[PDB]
Design a protein around this ligand. Structure first.
Ligand SMILES: *[C@@H]1O[C@H](CO[C@@H]2O[C@@H](C)[C@@H](O)[C@@H](O)[C@@H]2O)[C@@H](O[C@@H]2O[C@H](CO)[C@@H](O[C@@H]3O[C@H](CO)[C@@H](O)[C@H](O[C@H]4O[C@H](CO)[C@@H](O)[C@H](O)[C@@H]4O)[C@@H]3O)[C@H](O)[C@H]2NC(C)=O)[C@H](O)[C@H]1NC(C)=O
Ligand SMILES: *[C@@H]1O[C@H](CO[C@@H]2O[C@@H](C)[C@@H](O)[C@@H](O)[C@@H]2O)[C@@H](O[C@@H]2O[C@H](CO)[C@@H](O[C@@H]3O[C@H](CO)[C@@H](O)[C@H](O[C@H]4O[C@H](CO)[C@@H](O)[C@H](O)[C@@H]4O)[C@@H]3O)[C@H](O)[C@H]2NC(C)=O)[C@H](O)[C@H]1NC(C)=O
Ligand SMILES: *[C@@H]1O[C@H](CO)[C@@H](O[C@@H]2O[C@H](CO)[C@@H](O[C@@H]3O[C@H](CO)[C@@H](O)[C@H](O)[C@@H]3O)[C@H](O)[C@H]2NC(C)=O)[C@H](O)[C@H]1NC(C)=O
Ligand SMILES: *[C@@H]1O[C@H](CO)[C@@H](O[C@@H]2O[C@H](CO)[C@@H](O[C@@H]3O[C@H](CO)[C@@H](O)[C@H](O)[C@@H]3O)[C@H](O)[C@H]2NC(C)=O)[C@H](O)[C@H]1NC(C)=O
Ligand SMILES: *[C@@H]1O[C@H](CO)[C@@H](O[C@@H]2O[C@H](CO)[C@@H](O)[C@H](O)[C@H]2NC(C)=O)[C@H](O)[C@H]1NC(C)=O
Ligand SMILES: *[C@@H]1O[C@H](CO)[C@@H](O[C@@H]2O[C@H](CO)[C@@H](O)[C@H](O)[C@H]2NC(C)=O)[C@H](O)[C@H]1NC(C)=O
Ligand SMILES: *[C@@H]1O[C@H](CO)[C@@H](O[C@@H]2O[C@H](CO)[C@@H](O)[C@H](O)[C@H]2NC(C)=O)[C@H](O)[C@H]1NC(C)=O
Ligand SMILES: *[C@@H]1O[C@H](CO)[C@@H](O[C@@H]2O[C@H](CO)[C@@H](O)[C@H](O)[C@H]2NC(C)=O)[C@H](O)[C@H]1NC(C)=O
Ligand SMILES: *[C@@H]1O[C@H](CO[C@@H]2O[C@@H](C)[C@@H](O)[C@@H](O)[C@@H]2O)[C@@H](O)[C@H](O)[C@H]1NC(C)=O
Ligand SMILES: *[C@@H]1O[C@H](CO[C@@H]2O[C@@H](C)[C@@H](O)[C@@H](O)[C@@H]2O)[C@@H](O)[C@H](O)[C@H]1NC(C)=O
Ligand SMILES: COc1ccc(OC)c(S(=O)(=O)Nc2cnc3ccccc3c2)c1
Ligand SMILES: COc1ccc(OC)c(S(=O)(=O)Nc2cnc3ccccc3c2)c1
Ligand SMILES: [Ca+2]
Ligand SMILES: [Ca+2]
Ligand SMILES: [Mg+2]
Ligand SMILES: [Mg+2]
Ligand SMILES: [Zn+2]
Ligand SMILES: [Zn+2]
Ligand SMILES: [Zn+2]
Ligand SMILES: [Zn+2]
Lengths: 482, 482
């Protein structure tokens, strides 16, 4: 390849000098008060995933790909974060969520509780509860909201409003009798009771809010999408009844009514679009379901009204599931969609009074290499054959997972298969039903007031402490001190 | 595990508040002139490799490992760098070296030339030569030196002083007749002729400096350690003869006299300790060979004399070879040794007038996971069995490489083998003689004057441009402008 302009040293030198000039200009630090705070979380978005997503996004416009800039790549400041649970070397989605939402490290499988709690033991929930940055912002008088592509009562979204010993207790249908007798409430119940004035909630998980055995409104014939609650509670009606009767509250479940709302009138919005987890971006039905960008735009439009700012949390959660299934295409497309949502959010706000942070909870064992030529398709093959079995192979691989395939002592001959298919599983080393997480560090991109405080290598729980200080909320309020 | 103190939220909150206090103090930027510049390069040191090395270093002191802090982890500032060649999507060790030493991106397999050069073509090299930061520092009047554990004429060390179309031309014994006729000089020849006043050179590659068939001084009976030059040149004598006769010059090849020199007296030092590449840290013979830390200390002691500062380049090069062989233990130990050398260097200098940068050239396909418990040995097994074949597996794996082992259609019982051995090869997905590089981004750690200029996501060639500006050398000299 080697584009023509790239063969002149002057081109590279001029680009480097321009970057240096911008860096020198960046020494006038932004020391203003962050009226607004927005967090973007990519579930499982490792550094390798970020690079692969950048390459794919570049190639989608018919460019070589490597020189493309992601939206998050334009964030002025970058840092590294370690993501180990107090209980596990390779973290989970719950302990990390507690670490980066409440500021305290906890055990894996528990949400909103300190390390003194034991998984699946009700007692230890009492006296070991920790609040989240969302609660601090709400107590400060701001507006808060949650947007995600997974279930609302999933680990990441639930780590901001709930305190539970087990992450599997989505509703009372999944709680052992001992836990119920001891007096423990499930995550779905805690969503509508712990904090009763959450302005914006959007995502999936419609089956966990209705009495058991009730047919779904979207899939009437689907027997797996029925309600699960054993106490007969209709949680949507409970959510509606907890808000003032002189305000405006809306419940939506489908794309047509999402785009018909007037954000200048709505005050409280609840949206559940799928019975469980929302579909992949490549499998999405653009007629009935919305994309992440549209939800983010609507949420920001609704939230920006309060004169005291707002806090918003956005999660791209299906990257984790895509990696778990061993389908790199789906995960990369999810990452690209999240980057587009980040760009939209950046377009809708201003950096002189808004602090924005993008990060991930953990990593995976996804790898890509093989000495590929410039511009080679991210889902393509390696230039050479294997010098041991004389068979081809792809540039993307997994340490473990369902991609393992050895038909009678011999590996597969991918030449005879469609390796660019949407649901293709790259080969792995050891066969597992699901591929596991990774224990490497993750990257954090920050832009806005006091964003320079995230400068080097930090523990995960440090992330919410700086943001609070930027917004003059929480335990420390020295920024606004006279 | 879960140490006792970690079960209290107050502990984590206090730690986070202390970190925030330090960050708030870092706002008074260091805008001084960098009298000295030091670069640490880890060949193949990816983010996952850094995390694994941190865990191993922590465990070597009988700690859980995850909470340990590396020396480079204490560097105030962190950034991310992209490492693609103009010719390849997955980079090589030569084009990246040119990018981060001269400030221009080039093709893979070529050293010190722009992208207009074609690999293995002498007559395309004239007029396409690019100088390195070492040359800029030397022209500024500073002292310069190179220290590495690989051959001195390897790609990374050679990118700073040589201009060649092919990286394989270590000496005339590896040059095709057409290249010799056209007027090509090999890398080893260029080492002693391009720049004739390099103060400190240390590393391997003793066979490439002597006439062909001349027996080595260390391994007399070793037939593979004999000289290779076909022109009869003794390059050590040439190096000695190019220096003034009223100065002091020393040549050493073995640990005893490396520690007997007086740095306050020596002016020019050349040290070649192994015929080819230096041994692994685990296989090193401490009696005859030195470690990286000792060489770094001696080099800094010699260099700090010049009243105008100095520039030093240090390379831990055997991490790449360890990963290529598929032996994670050796690579992790090499990374730990490099971190120790970084600590020694930091101890020997001051941050008020010295700018220090640590980074890598590219990454690998090394992965580690498996949901391990806190404190689990980095070289240990995963807690569970494989739910597909009912056999164990390790937490460390490779995308490809020699670790592949499938006899009779069945993978290995690792339990019947020593998986903690020094030369154990973790299983991989596709069998290759050597495992390949990785195309993910790499991390950069900076500390010292103007170190804050490396803040976000940058191209690799941007790295040397900032350093020069910090030291008031090169094309841009605006820092010292009245
Ligand atoms: C792994 O797989 C490769 C390629 O697989 C191929 O890809 C799929 C897309 C689909 O076409 C599959 O059916 C197909 O296998 C294997 O490469 C094949 O190798 C065999 C020998 O083992 C070749 O045998 C052919 O036999 C004929 C000899 O008379 C003749 O047709 C062929 O020569 C001709 O090949 C093509 C045929 O389309 C023709 O266009 C050319 O002009 C040429 O004369 C050839 O000798 C197959 O052709 C190969 N198929 C290819 C290259 O697509 C490979 O063997 C296997 N590897 C291992 C290690 O088992
Ligand atoms: C993969 O490998 C595992 C473990 O490998 C084992 O460890 C290595 C370090 C080395 O010792 C290897 O030789 C050894 O295989 C295999 O686990 C074995 O599984 C078999 C079948 O179940 C057991 O068979 C034995 O047969 C006897 C009848 O009961 C009896 O001696 C054994 O019970 C005894 O088990 C151990 C022996 O030291 C001990 O707890 C008591 O002595 C107890 O009575 C047992 O039933 C082997 O013992 C197992 N070996 C080990 C070390 O656990 C595994 O089968 C294999 N997996 C596959 C899928 O092939
Ligand atoms: C997307 O969501 C909207 C809002 O729920 C859906 O519109 C709804 O459509 C149903 C079925 O036609 C309407 O029910 C009907 O309403 C009246 C009486 O109220 C009457 O026609 C029938 O007896 C029946 O009850 C419902 O009113 C209507 N809701 C609103 C707010 O207009 C829409 O169909 C959904 N679209 C897709 C493509 O899924
Ligand atoms: C490490 O390196 C030093 C320095 O090269 C080695 O010492 C050197 O050993 C040689 C071989 O024995 C000495 O040469 C001998 O010297 C005298 C005459 O000068 C005489 O014994 C022999 O005729 C021979 O020429 C040499 O002098 C000596 N040091 C120096 C500075 O020249 C040492 O052996 C090495 N150690 C190891 C463990 O490899
Ligand atoms: C949590 O409550 C449970 C009730 O299920 C307690 O479990 C019993 O506790 C007593 C006191 O130690 C033990 O003698 C019993 O053996 C326990 N039973 C079981 C099945 O574990 C549990 O101890 C309580 N935890 C605390 C901290 O008081
Ligand atoms: C909504 O999804 C539909 C169905 O997949 C898309 O229609 C496809 O569009 C692609 C891209 O142009 C075509 O290659 C397919 O042939 C179309 N399929 C059908 C059945 O018509 C549609 O483009 C999507 N709309 C948006 C706005 O993204
Ligand atoms: C650089 O030199 C090579 C020969 O070493 C030239 O190669 C050309 O191609 C063939 C290859 O065998 C030679 O026989 C031709 O004489 C060469 N010339 C042409 C015009 O093709 C190559 O062209 C040279 N490049 C330049 C710019 O002079
Ligand atoms: C130099 O290397 C030698 C040889 O490995 C080391 O001596 C051994 O060190 C190991 C590790 O502590 C011990 O288990 C052995 O008992 C030692 N003796 C032998 C004969 O192997 C020696 O410690 C190393 N020296 C330094 C300073 O690292
Ligand atoms: C839910 O219903 C299950 C099946 O019973 C019948 O069929 C389903 C499809 C519904 O129409 C249901 O109302 C019918 O009774 C039962 O096995 C299950 O016990 C029912 N659950 C409850 C809580 O009643
Ligand atoms: C290099 O040497 C080859 C083998 O010679 C052996 O090694 C040398 C160093 C002496 O010890 C000699 O007695 C041994 O027999 C020769 O075959 C070869 O031609 C030589 N090559 C050159 C270029 O001189
Ligand atoms: C123990 O750590 C975790 C954490 C979260 C997690 O996902 C909830 C898993 S999982 O891989 O077992 N669940 C899966 C698996 N395959 C899926 C495929 C398609 C859609 C959704 C999926 C969900 C493991
Ligand atoms: C094409 O990209 C590169 C770049 C550098 C490189 O290393 C020079 C290699 S290599 O893997 O083929 N060389 C190797 C291989 N195994 C080794 C084992 C032990 C000691 C040294 C080794 C050296 C490939
Ligand atoms: Ca839907
Ligand atoms: Ca030696
Ligand atoms: Mg999640
Ligand atoms: Mg190297
Ligand atoms: Zn997760
Ligand atoms: Zn997961
Ligand atoms: Zn390299
Ligand atoms: Zn290499």
């Amino acid at each position: 390849l080697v584009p023509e302009k790239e063969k002149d040293p002057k081109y590279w030198r001029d680009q480097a000098q321009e970057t240096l000039k911008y860096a020198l200009e960046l020494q006038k630090l932004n020391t203003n008060v962050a009226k607004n705070v927005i967090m973007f979380l990519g579930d499982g978005m490792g550094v390798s995933t970020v690079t692969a997503a950048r390459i794919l996004k570049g190639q989608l416009h018919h460019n070589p790909g490597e020189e493309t800039r992601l939206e998050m790549d334009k964030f002025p400041f970058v840092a590294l974060s370690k993501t180990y649970n107090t209980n596990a070397q390779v973290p989970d989605s719950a302990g990390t969520a507690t670490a980066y939402l409440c500021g305290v490290k906890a055990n894996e499988g528990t949400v909103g509780v300190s390390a003194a709690t034991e998984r699946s033991r009700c007692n230890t929930t009492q006296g070991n509860e920790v609040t989240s940055i969302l609660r601090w912002a709400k107590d400060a008088g701001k507006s808060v909201g949650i947007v995600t592509t997974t279930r609302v009562n999933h680990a990441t979204p639930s780590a901001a409003y709930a305190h539970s010993a087990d992450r599997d207790w989505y509703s009372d249908n999944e709680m052992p009798p001992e836990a119920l007798s001891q007096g423990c409430k499930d995550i779905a119940y805690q969503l509508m009771h712990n904090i009763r004035d959450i302005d914006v909630i959007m995502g999936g998980g419609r089956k966990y809010m209705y009495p058991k055995n009730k047919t779904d409104v979207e899939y009437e014939s689907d027997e797996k999408a029925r309600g699960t609650r054993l106490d007969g509670l209709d949680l949507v009606d409970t959510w509606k009844s907890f808000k003032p009767r002189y305000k405006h509250s809306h419940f939506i479940w489908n794309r047509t009514e999402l785009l018909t709302l007037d954000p200048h009138n709505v005050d409280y919005l609840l949206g559940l679009f799928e019975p469980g987890d929302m579909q992949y971006e490549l499998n999405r039905n653009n007629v009935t379901d919305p994309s992440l960008s549209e939800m983010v735009v609507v949420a920001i439009q609704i939230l920006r009204k309060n004169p005291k700012g707002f806090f918003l949390l956005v999660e791209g959660g299906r990257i984790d599931h895509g990696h778990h299934e061993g389908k790199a295409k789906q995960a990369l497309h999810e990452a690209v969609e999240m980057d587009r949502a980040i760009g939209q959010a950046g377009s809708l706000t201003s950096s002189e009074d808004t602090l924005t942070v993008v990060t991930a909870d953990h990593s995976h064992v996804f790898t890509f290499g093989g000495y590929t030529p410039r511009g080679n398709s991210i889902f393509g093959l390696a230039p050479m054959l294997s010098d041991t079995d004389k068979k081809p192979f792809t540039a993307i691989l997994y340490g473990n997972g369902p991609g393992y395939k050895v038909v009678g002592g011999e590996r597969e001959n991918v030449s005879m298969v469609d390796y660019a298919h949407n649901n293709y599983q790259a080969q792995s080393a050891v066969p597992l039903r699901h591929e596991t997480h990774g224990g490497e560090d993750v990257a954090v991109f920050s832009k806005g007031p006091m964003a320079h405080l995230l400068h080097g290598v930090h523990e995960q729980n440090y992330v919410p402490h700086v943001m609070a200080y930027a917004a003059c909320i929480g335990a420390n309020l020295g920024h606004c001190a006279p």
